[PDB]
Design a protein around this nucleic acid. Structure first.
Lengths: 76, 98, 95, 37, 210, 85, 127, 149, 148
RNA sequence: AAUAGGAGUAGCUUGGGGACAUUCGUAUUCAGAUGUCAGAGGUGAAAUUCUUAGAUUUUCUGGAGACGAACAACUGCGAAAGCAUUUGUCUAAAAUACUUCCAUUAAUCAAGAACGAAAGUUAAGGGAGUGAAGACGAUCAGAUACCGUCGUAAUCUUAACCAUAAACUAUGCCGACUAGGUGUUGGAUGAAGUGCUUCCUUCAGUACCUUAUGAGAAAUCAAAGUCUUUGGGUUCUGGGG
């Protein structure tokens, strides 16, 4: 009955209603501790602000961050 | 790839710098110190290349060898006549100078 | 007609393939169609092997095996009874 | 006839040979025209 | 016929048995002094039949005839080959062969060529019958294998390099390096050929021999 | 307007001689008078002045070359082989 | 004490060659074919012919004085066939029976890495 | 797909919420300035939007600002004479031709040259129908490097 | 006027007297006016240099072989020819080369040759269309024609 | 901002896609050695053939062209023809992922064009093996054939042509909708074996099995279905022998 099926979330991008599986993330760097806006699925290198040390390594999936760091979802 | 990167930078310079190409302009630019960077095609007659290199070295600016040939450096600078040597005398907002 | 769904050969997603040549008559045959038998064969019989072991040094001697792999064309394969005729319904049977 | 030549259900002589025989005949006619004209 | 004469075949110091047979050689008459006919021929010795150890039975060594005194031939190292049955046995479909090779030179200035084979391993969570690696991966594995072998070969004197071949060190090293990128299985050196041996010194050859 | 359907450069020979012979000449002559690019300057001015001798008009400089071209393929392969070492 | 020679056995679907030699290859001991021992102008492939040939070479080799043999088998070749011919088994059996000591046995059949084009047409031998 | 085979459903698609999301507090003026700077320093518009999204943290400039990025670039006057997509296609054509000029035997590269050349003509025809290209512009095999300079 | 290959005017500076002396070398293809030409045992393998055959790497293409040493070049001089070096003996001293006819020959190592193919390649590709061209060809050679 | 389209960006994405350079292996063959001694090749049976001036066979050096097995599949890539050794360089490609850009740019297409197996042609090299022609020996009442031995042209590279092939999924191409299960090659998402590995979910390739109160003249077909309940768009083609 495809009007309002709740557990359809698992289907491919292009469902009953479009919805991105991509979001923005509030991230901070271990030992430097400044807030940064960042994109889950970022496509080019991502630096920490005070001294440019890499944060996230881009690669063609969801992107792999670094071993460190802590991440809130930045959805309102 | 490295050459292509130079060519892209050069394309920016061509669009928004101040530049001049040809022997006499090159000599005046270096002599003045107006020049910031000299870009020389491989083909160039040896004696002229040598003089430009010496002048540039003397007036303390870089000389950079262009990967291809005289026509190609001209088409890279958007012109339909071969070029041999050009002097950037003011960079555009480009990453060229480093 | 159109007896064989895949024409007795494994061609899909491929325009062309190499011929290999039939070992028992030399004819050309496409590798996707050819009847391949990885015949593992011993250099001699058992009673021969027994006599060789008896004769041999070492006493832990072991006879060497033969590694061949023979490719047959359709005519040869059916003639020397590698592949039986079978029956119309059972033509998709294998293993 | 039409494009699908061959098909030997009828038992007619080999299509390729018929083609070879006819190609030879055509050559000979073409040669004769060359002498005449 | 009647004019032949036996000569004993000795092998260098590292091998255990060091008497791998007797060879007959034709007539002693001038101007062809028999020694010349004896010199330069080549011997395929099974490696097991040289140590007395059947775990090396799928390897054979080439030993070349290079120096003679009277009744004795002492020989030099000439190459290393795998027995064709063993090579076939390793090959079974659903696994994928990887073959490297390269040219390399010794500290002694022998130029050699090495042919190195390597097979994939299934490992336990895989299930699925086929185990083939990505082509990009096999290319990386092949380069890595070539790199290890040329580095290992280049280092030492020839006698030690040959000695290294005997308990098969090279394969173990190749497997350990490649494990991170892909699991491997029975990794051997299929063939070794000497390409350009340096000019002979009887002194050095015998001193190595004793 | 378009003078010949085929012949071009070899039209000077006229109705004389074999067509096949003329065709072979046509290929070599098209190659022969072709202006090569001069790798001593970047102009397309290199011409043949005599059997093996190729002058650039702009550079006033003589390149030694083939019979019918600035570069024969044999020489090009040899040159590359040397370069590689 | 013991001494080894190398017994090259070539079986083709005609002849079964027994050619035993010195350990270096170079320098023969006895070449004796299979065709030698039978006047039939067939049956150079035969087990029987091969058996006769084997016993005589074994007898001669014992007279000569090398006691024992390594066997190097060879089937025809990549340009014709990879199958060891019929009499090869017979020759091996006869040699073991004879009383010589039977050392390492190896296949050195000449295989082609490639596939250089073999004789008979694309449509192969039609016999 | 336009040429070859295969549908290829790779795509990327905006959420249902089409307003500015509350978390981003940057105002239009700052973002306008930033976009202009990136272009001026030499970057191509598709890259500028992507670069802006990741580095500066703005998804969907059309929600955070009143106007699409090509339009604002044009409004501030800085936008390229040849449209971006056409320009890159011409670049691809020039490179391909350079290879073919050196090497005359590559059948696939020549097949691709015909295919790409046709694609340029189709896109060019659309740009002529708009007023984003000069009417007497044409593209030629000869001119191609020089053309896009 | 004799041969298809052009001749190359080469200047050296004398080794026991002041000033410049001119020789005539036969030109390799791809060489040019204002090129520096080097001759000798230590000369680098590069086109149009003159080197002893003993110092070639194998499979190089050469011309101007001296059939025996010091003879100033006597094999491989006609247009578009070359020889190939095919081998160096283990004790050195001799070298093995291939003349363009199809024979293999063995020469002394210290014999000269010139790196690169002889100039004016492909000369007999072009057909001689008319009799007068043949007349002009023989006119600068030798009276030997028309044949009869 | 079209599960339309194009363009972009990203990943130690992918692959026997293309091109050029490059490199190695093996047999076969030639030449040079080497030891042997009578037959060896050849077959349904045999002969023609080759062999005491040492064949066949043994092993080694050097040369040469050819091919690149095994691994290798109801596998991969290519518009299709087609494409399988090594590394490099130059190239293209598709999928995926993408809160990146453009905003209908499209679909199929008479005209015209690009590529287009194999043979054949023209020209230079090149020439191992194979081998239309041809020559013999056989087989047969006969054999211009099947079989055998030898053997030009062609086969290979370069440079032109030729424009056809049962050039075959004998299934035009684009678009929506239908029904399961078994797999498999390529990505991406989650969870569970020792960062990595696996499995789950899901795309795009791609086959198979079962099922068609679907279809078909049946064979059979997940398209040949959604059709006298006949019309989603379009190019081409056929009309008894």
């Amino acid at each position: 009955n495809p009007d309002p099926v709740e557990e359809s979330k698992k289907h491919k991008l292009k469902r009953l209603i479009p919805t991105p599986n991509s979001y923005f993330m509030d991230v901070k760097c271990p030992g430097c501790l400044q807030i940064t806006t960042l994109f889950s699925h970022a496509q080019n290198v991502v630096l920490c602000g005070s001294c440019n040390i890499m944060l996230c390594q881009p690669t063609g999936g969801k992107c792999k961050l670094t071993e460190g760091c802590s991440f809130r979802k930045k959805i309102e | 790839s490295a050459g292509d990167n130079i060519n892209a930078k050069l394309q920016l310079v061509m669009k928004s710098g101040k530049y001049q190409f040809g022997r006499k302009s090159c000599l005046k630019a270096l002599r003045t110190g107006k020049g910031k960077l000299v870009i020389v095609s491989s083909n160039c007659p040896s004696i002229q290349r040598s003089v430009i290199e010496y002048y540039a070295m003397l007036s303390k600016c870089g000389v950079h060898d262009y990967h291809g040939d005289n026509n190609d450096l001209g088409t890279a600078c958007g012109k339909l006549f071969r070029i041999s040597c050009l002097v950037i005398t003011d960079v555009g907002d480009s990453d060229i100078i480093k | 007609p159109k007896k064989r769904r895949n024409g007795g050969r494994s061609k899909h997603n491929r325009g062309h393939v190499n011929p290999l040549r039939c070992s028992n008559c030399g004819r050309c045959v496409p590798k996707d169609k050819a009847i391949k038998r990885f015949n593992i064969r011993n250099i001699v019989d058992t009673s021969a092997q027994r006599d060789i072991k008896e004769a041999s040094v070492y006493s832990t001697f072991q006879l060497p095996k033969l590694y061949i792999k023979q490719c047959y064309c359709v005519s040869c394969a059916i003639h020397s009874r590698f592949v039986r005729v079978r029956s119309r319904e059972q033509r998709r049977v294998r293993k | 006839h039409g494009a699908s030549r061959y098909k030997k259900s009828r038992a007619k002589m080999r299509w390729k040979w018929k083609k070879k025989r006819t190609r030879r005949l055509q050559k000979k006619r073409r040669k004769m025209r060359q002498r005449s004209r | 016929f009647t004019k032949k004469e036996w000569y004993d075949l000795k092998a260098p110091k590292m091998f255990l048995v060091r008497n791998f047979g007797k060879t007959l050689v034709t007539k002693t008459i001038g101007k062809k002094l028999a020694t010349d006919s004896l010199k330069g021929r080549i011997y395929e010795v099974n490696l097991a039949d040289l140590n007395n150890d059947e775990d090396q039975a799928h390897k054979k060594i080439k030993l070349s005839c290079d120096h003679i005194i009277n009744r004795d031939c002492y020989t030099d190292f000439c190459g290393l080959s795998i027995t064709r049955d063993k090579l076939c046995s390793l090959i079974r479909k659903g696994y994928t062969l990887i073959e490297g090779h390269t040219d390399v030179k010794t500290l002694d200035n022998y130029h050699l060529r090495m042919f190195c084979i390597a097979f994939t391993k299934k490992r336990q969570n895989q299930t699925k019958s086929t185990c083939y690696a990505q082509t990009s991966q096999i290319k990386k594995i092949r380069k890595k294998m070539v790199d290890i072998m040329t580095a290992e070969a280049s280092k030492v004197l020839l006698k030690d390099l040959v000695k290294k071949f005997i308990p098969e060190s090279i394969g173990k090293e190749i497997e350990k390096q490649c494990k991170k990128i892909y699991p491997l299985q029975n990794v051997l050196i299929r063939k070794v050929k000497i390409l350009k041996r340096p000019k002979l010194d009887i002194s050095k050859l015998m001193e190595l021999h004793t | 307007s378009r003078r010949t359907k085929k012949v071009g450069l070899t039209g000077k020979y006229g109705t004389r001689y074999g067509s096949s012979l003329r065709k072979q000449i046509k290929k070599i002559e098209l190659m022969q008078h072709a202006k090569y690019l001069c790798t001593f300057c970047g102009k397309t001015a290199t011409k043949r002045t005599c059997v093996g001798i190729w002058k650039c008009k702009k550079c006033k400089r003589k390149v030694c070359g083939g019979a019918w071209s600035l570069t024969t393929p044999a020489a090009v392969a040899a040159k590359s082989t040397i370069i590689r070492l | 004490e013991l001494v080894f020679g190398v017994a090259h056995i070539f079986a083709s679907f005609n002849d079964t060659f027994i050619h035993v030699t010195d350990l270096s290859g170079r320098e023969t001991l006895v070449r004796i074919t299979g065709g030698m021992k039978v006047k039939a102008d067939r049956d150079e492939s035969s087990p029987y012919a091969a058996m006769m040939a084997a016993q005589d070479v074994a007898a001669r080799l014992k007279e000569l004085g090398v006691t024992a043999i390594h066997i190097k088998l060879r089937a025809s070749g990549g340009t014709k066939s990879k199958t060891p011919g019929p009499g090869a088994q017979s020759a091996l059996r006869a040699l073991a029976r004879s009383g010589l000591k039977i050392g390492r046995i190896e296949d050195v059949t000449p295989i082609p890495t490639d596939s250089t084009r073999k004789k008979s047409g694309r449509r192969g031998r039609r016999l | 797909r336009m040429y070859g085979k295969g549908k290829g459903i790779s795509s990327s698609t905006l959420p249902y919420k089409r307003k500015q999301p509350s978390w981003l507090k940057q105002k239009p003026s700052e973002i306008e300035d930033a976009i202009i700077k990136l272009a001026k320093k030499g970057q191509t518009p598709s890259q500028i939007g992507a670069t802006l999204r990741d580095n500066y943290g703005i998804p969907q400039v059309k929600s955070v600002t009143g106007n699409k990025i090509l339009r604002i670039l044009r409004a501030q006057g800085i936008a390229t004479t040849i449209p971006e997509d056409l320009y890159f296609l011409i670049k691809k054509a020039v490179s391909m031709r350079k290879h073919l000029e050196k090497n005359k035997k590559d059948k696939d590269c020549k097949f691709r040259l015909i295919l790409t050349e046709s694609k340029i003509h189709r896109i060019s025809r659309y740009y002529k129908r708009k007023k984003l290209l000069p009417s007497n512009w044409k593209y030629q095999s000869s001119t191609a490097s020089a053309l896009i300079a | 006027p004799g041969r298809g290959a052009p001749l190359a005017k080469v200047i050296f500076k004398r080794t026991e007297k002041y000033g410049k002396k001119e020789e005539l070398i036969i030109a390799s293809e791809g060489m040019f006016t204002g090129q520096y030409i080097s001759c000798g045992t230590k000369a680098p393998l590069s086109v149009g240099n003159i080197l002893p055959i003993g110092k070639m790497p194998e499979g190089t293409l050469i011309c101007n072989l001296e059939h025996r040493t010091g003879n100033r070049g006597t094999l491989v001089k006609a247009s578009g020819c070359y020889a190939t070096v095919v081998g160096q003996s283990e004790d050195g001293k001799k070298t093995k080369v291939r003349l363009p006819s199809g024979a293999k020959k063995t020469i002394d190592a210290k014999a000269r040759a010139m790196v690169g193919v002889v100039g004016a390649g492909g000369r007999i590709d072009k057909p001689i269309l008319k009799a007068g061209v043949a007349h002009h060809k023989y006119r600068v050679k030798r009276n030997c024609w028309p044949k009869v």
